[PDB]
Amino acid sequence: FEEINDFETAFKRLLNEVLEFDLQNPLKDVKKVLCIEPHPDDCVIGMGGTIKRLTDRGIEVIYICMTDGYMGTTDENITGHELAQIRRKEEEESAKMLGVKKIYWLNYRDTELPYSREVRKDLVKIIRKEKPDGVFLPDPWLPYEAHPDHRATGFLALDAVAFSPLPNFSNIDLDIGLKPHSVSFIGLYYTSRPNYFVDITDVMDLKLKAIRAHKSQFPDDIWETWEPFLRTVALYYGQKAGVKYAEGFRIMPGLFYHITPFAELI
Amino acid sequence: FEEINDFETAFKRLLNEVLEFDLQNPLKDVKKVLCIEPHPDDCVIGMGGTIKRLTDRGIEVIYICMTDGYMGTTDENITGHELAQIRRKEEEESAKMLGVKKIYWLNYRDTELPYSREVRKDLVKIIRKEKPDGVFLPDPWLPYEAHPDHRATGFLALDAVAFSPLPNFSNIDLDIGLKPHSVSFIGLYYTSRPNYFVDITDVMDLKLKAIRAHKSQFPDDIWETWEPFLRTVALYYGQKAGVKYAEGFRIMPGLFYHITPFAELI
Amino acid sequence: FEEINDFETAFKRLLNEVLEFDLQNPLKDVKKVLCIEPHPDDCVIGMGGTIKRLTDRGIEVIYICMTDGYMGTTDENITGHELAQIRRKEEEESAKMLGVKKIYWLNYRDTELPYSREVRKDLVKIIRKEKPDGVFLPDPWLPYEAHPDHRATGFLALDAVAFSPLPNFSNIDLDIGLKPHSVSFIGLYYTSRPNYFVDITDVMDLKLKAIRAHKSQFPDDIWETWEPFLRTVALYYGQKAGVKYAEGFRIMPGLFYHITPFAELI
Amino acid sequence: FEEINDFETAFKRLLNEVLEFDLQNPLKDVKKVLCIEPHPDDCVIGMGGTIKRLTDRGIEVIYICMTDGYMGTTDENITGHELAQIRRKEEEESAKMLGVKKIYWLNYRDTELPYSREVRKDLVKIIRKEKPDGVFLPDPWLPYEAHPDHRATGFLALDAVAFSPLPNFSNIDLDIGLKPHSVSFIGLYYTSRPNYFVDITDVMDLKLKAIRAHKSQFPDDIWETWEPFLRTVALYYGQKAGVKYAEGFRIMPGLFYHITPFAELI
Amino acid sequence: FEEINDFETAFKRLLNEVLEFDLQNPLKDVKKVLCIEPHPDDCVIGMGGTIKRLTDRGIEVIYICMTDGYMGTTDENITGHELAQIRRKEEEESAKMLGVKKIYWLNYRDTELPYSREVRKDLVKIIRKEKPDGVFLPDPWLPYEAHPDHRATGFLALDAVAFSPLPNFSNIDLDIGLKPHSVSFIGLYYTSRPNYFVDITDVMDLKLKAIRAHKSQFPDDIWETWEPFLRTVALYYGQKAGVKYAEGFRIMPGLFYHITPFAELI
Amino acid sequence: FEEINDFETAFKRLLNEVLEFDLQNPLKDVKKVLCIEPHPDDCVIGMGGTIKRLTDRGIEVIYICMTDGYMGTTDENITGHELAQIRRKEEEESAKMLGVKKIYWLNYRDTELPYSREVRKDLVKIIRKEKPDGVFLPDPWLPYEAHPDHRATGFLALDAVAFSPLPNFSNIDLDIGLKPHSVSFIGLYYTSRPNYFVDITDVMDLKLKAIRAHKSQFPDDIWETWEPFLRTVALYYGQKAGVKYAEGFRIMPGLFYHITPFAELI
Ligand SMILES: [Cl-]
Ligand SMILES: [Cl-]
Ligand SMILES: [Cl-]
Ligand SMILES: [Cl-]
Ligand SMILES: [Zn+2]
Ligand SMILES: [Zn+2]
Ligand SMILES: [Zn+2]
Ligand SMILES: [Zn+2]
Ligand SMILES: [Zn+2]
Ligand SMILES: [Zn+2]
């Protein structure tokens, strides 16, 4: 590689020959994935269509939900305890409509999710137990994301995936018979720099039915705003992918999440 | 909205019809605003002109100052306790010169402002009490902002505004008779992605006199650097707005601060 | 400066006359610098070539390593305690090969570096003791940096530099006879927005030998991936600087790290 | 007082003349008290009889409950969210049976109550709003108390009472129009060093009915153990007070909670 | 129990009939116990003899060590990383000499053991996996215990035992197939209020050989002080039990660790 | 020591021969001591008399004050910043009246002193710099001490003394040329289990003048209560020592602060 005198060549060779990074079929071998959502309803809102598509193709999809959704209401007659119970039933209904069979609830309180070692260990435990091929998580670099649970979940999910294979990390996991694990695939959903698209034209009406199942979050008057907003998001991704309705994801080789100044160039 | 096949149309309709988002007069009905500053002098440096303009138009402007300014000196003869006392008198003088009548001091120590639930609750209490129509806060995504108190204040102010209307958030506030509150208007000051401008050509000399009132922060020799820097900032904003001297703000609909991949497009 | 009617003029004058900012020879008077690395091997990987060039020019280079490298292995036979010992010897060998004489080990555990006042005070102590002219640190705004130790180190280094000269900050340092200190020079390594380059075509094979000295981190099979990745990075910086192999740095005047909306413009 | 040469005399004079400390009728003027409980059911279990006696005498009793009781079950079919909802209804029933009209729920999670400034501020807010004459709280020095929520509540309640009257403590409370407040009376319940007793012979069957109202906590099989345990506690206090069934409290002058080496002598 | 009019009767019946509390053989059915030690060497120093006695009787003894022993040296030539490696080998040798076959290392750093939910979860995981009949832990109420790791370990071990059987506590443990678990037996070692004794006259020379195996901690000159100190401790316990050399333990019914004012009476 | 068959003998030998523990003159070689106080005025109130006696005997006494005294007023007209300034001047006057030359201010805020590694390191730095022979600190086991700053200071002081001599603890101190340090002498003031007394009948009126110097803390009406309280405390210690007025201290050999079940027996 000392032979090479020009960046684009080196870059092309690094990606294509050295890393063998494929953006055309990057879910080739994947049989099990984790979707990590900050609140009940985030998996379905950000990639509900893709989830349905994967379950139909007989890929096993497992949700990890970081919080209980305790705060998500303006109704003074509903306690956070009542609302958590409700949003558990709602995500159970929603997850059944897409093919999703298992949900792990971390049960950190909505608005109170720590960026801490503790939460890294909670995720690394599940990854080591379920040995998934791929993990989906919200992009922590989404510009203007003011929800701290969202930002946190992103960094934690990356940290967890990064540390799952390190046997000195959360070592009691090994001592009780969980083996360390490398994930093959990482995809960021809720991203503004997607580089992989999935047509959801055919499943858009199911996706919206699975979102609406979260009745607590979507009364008629809120739905007036959110059905348009969601169709607009699907068109934004759609236009880039040459279809009506798409879901955007950012997929990179693991190496590019660390000390890569040209990471923004894929 | 199923009717729509292209993004730009959907985008235009979302902004114009669904959200009714106005960049021509977004302060229409605003009678009271909060300006949140990390240190004494930040409201005046970032939007002192706009504050004067608002008070002249008979709009009530209330400062929330996050810290005491304990660290802001190189003089070995001044203790942090002395400096805090001084910077309280300075901001009191400065605030009088602009039309500003109330300041809340959180009194967290300069350089030690936590990114915590506690501080969210301190802000949400004031918002519920003062029921402001609009809130101004420093842009936390300002590139190359190395002051941790600045970054923190931005995220906290957004969190506070987002959570003020949720009755299960800091619920003791309700139990002692503070009602939940929605803010109509959010504006980010100290931003590099402004999309709303205020002419301060006419109030620039008052703005500089109100900055200079912070004598502790601005001895003659420091002022040699800072009067130029401030004129340059006002020109940068000015050029974009077609005037000599402007203050820039980023204003978006509340919806766009959460899971909006096209947020950077306004 | 009231005279000026256009931004670009004011900008040019602010940079050239007021701030005297020089990008052609910014290491004029620099005799002593600190290189702050999150892990053992980060100084060598991010600016090993530049460090050699500085040593040869008789500039004193001191490493501060934030963590012990406890987690950096997939081998189930190596404890984090064994690995820390090993990576100490490796960085000692690597530091010998470049001209580096002194290493401070903070010994926070890999993956567990706090963003806290405590760690700010640990750095400020070293800066006040060594009174360095310049500090190098990894760019905390590097896009897609998922390693929390990296993000943390960047913000802490800037905080430390900013607070070293404040006598009310960590005041016990003064009480035991460490004087406050201003550093002249700040340079961000591992950056995607570099604006200063150093030719390392001549030292590239030494740099790779000094990286390979970290045997724990770079077995044959991993080096198949990392020798290409590093040549590609050096070309990326190289293309921008018009040479084969360069190391990129971002250098700005201290003022631009605070409330500067045109900071992105240098 | 320089006249005095013997401790017992000075001690007697300090208590009787200087402090005017009365153990015979120490609730003389009290019209409003707060009972602070770590979990739902702690007020009723530790002093349910005394509460009834006070409400019958037309004294206003307000509960502050620190936690939600999320963890208090071995039943794998009940979520912490369900159980919190349930224990809210149970304490509402229980509190109605005794004369208690108002409950504030802090809603910190069972087993997760922090010993933090935040929680001190939550209590000081309620004290300043309700201006109670007296506060009851569990004795933090109860030997062999392994429940961390119990230990925590005790220290926090004392801290809160101590800091309620300090206008520089949680100063935003004052800024929104809560005046500082001194409590006249402090009583520790769940104590092993009681020095004031209340006959509950006449209300013991109501106390047990109000405990049993917490059905979640007291199934038939658990009640086999807890009816005896509670009768035994009431006899232990009873024997000391010369009655069948009593509730023990430790009452001291505020001064004795700080730097008093003979505090254990009342 | 309404029948009873005097405490001593009720107390006797509570202990003997209701709780069936046995101080003659409280290890009756115990096949597996956990010994929790703050540092390498604490299990052997506090109850090494008892451990030997248990392994000879074919009872399975598992150590949980909370910290790595990083700080335990005055030798400036030994890093904390070197010392941890050493103290791992030492406790492995020591544990072999007593019958002990499993050690779990939490690897929190010596002097830095947090009193946190995280550490509770680490212990509860091991308890649920190993389903021990009994747990030994240092008495957190030991007067004049200044080592914060000691105090912490005590409270944490009690918390862990208390919370192991609650399915809503660390619920991910259940989701990955660890069942909740109740411990039958709790014994506090390093206690000044022991109420159960074990003769170690016959195993005292093995106990001292197993202590001495921690060479790092016990050079000749330190052993001059510690062999006497240990013989003195064994006599103190011995005198109370009517033997030369004993190890003291405090054993109570689980009920007495919560809201029991007469707990100090057994 | 195998020879010995009885505890009291072993105990006597351990104390007298092995540990050489002297309660008759335990300040033999002491030339320099630290007095650690949680608030300004705690050294003077707890051992002001003893301090004068030590100064007169030409022993160097250095105050470490943990907090700034920010909260200590009921006056709504005084800010915590004003009060800290004032209490600095007051402790400077008070310290002059006794022979005290040097005060280190940690400047943690009153009511907000952390029990953290950070604060341990702040104390260990001062101890290593001043190499004192002895340290005085408030007894953290003082029954009914409700002030969290007091409890915290005690544990921190002991931790600091324990860890000062460990070169792997706060190792950057060594890297900047502070040597590790063992203190010879530890004495607990504000204790209810004193075992060493100092006659202060001769200095009692100076002690009261040095307390009264803290005017902020002691207006006429408060002094009506505090002059009696202090005379009573001095008599309590006095009676035990067979004098009118004494100051009590608890002194033990360093070994007894760790795993010593008979520590209560001296
Ligand atoms: Cl662990
Ligand atoms: Cl497709
Ligand atoms: Cl506050
Ligand atoms: Cl009565
Ligand atoms: Zn969400
Ligand atoms: Zn600022
Ligand atoms: Zn690194
Ligand atoms: Zn309870
Ligand atoms: Zn230990
Ligand atoms: Zn005090």
Numbering used by the authors:
A (entry chain A), B (entry chain B), C (entry chain C), D (entry chain A), E (entry chain B), F (entry chain C): 2 to 267
Q: What does the study report here?
A:
Deacetylase from the extremophile Pyrococcus chitonophagus has been analyzed by X-ray crystallography, small-angle X-ray scattering, differential scanning calorimetry, isothermal titration calorimetry and NMR to determine its structure, thermodynamics and enzymatic properties. It is a hexameric, zinc-containing metalloenzyme that retains its structural integrity up to temperatures slightly exceeding 100 °C. It removes the acetyl group specifically from the non-reducing end of the sugar substrate. Pch-Dac crystallizes as ‘a dimer of trimers’, with two doughnut-shaped trimers stacked back-to-back along a molecular three-fold axis, with a 8–10 Å channel through the middle of this assembly.
Three crystal forms were analyzed, including monoclinic crystals of the protein-substrate complex (Pch-Dac-lig), having two protein hexamers in the crystal’s asymmetric unit and trigonal crystals of the unliganded protein (Pch-Dac), having half a hexamer in the asymmetric unit, with the other half being related by the crystallographic two-fold axis. Three of its ligands are provided by the protein’s conserved His-Asp-His triad and the fourth, in an unliganded structure, is a single water molecule wedged between two catalytic residues, His259* and Asp42. Two neighboring Pch-Dac hexamers had been extracted from the trigonal crystal lattice and used to improve the curve fitting.
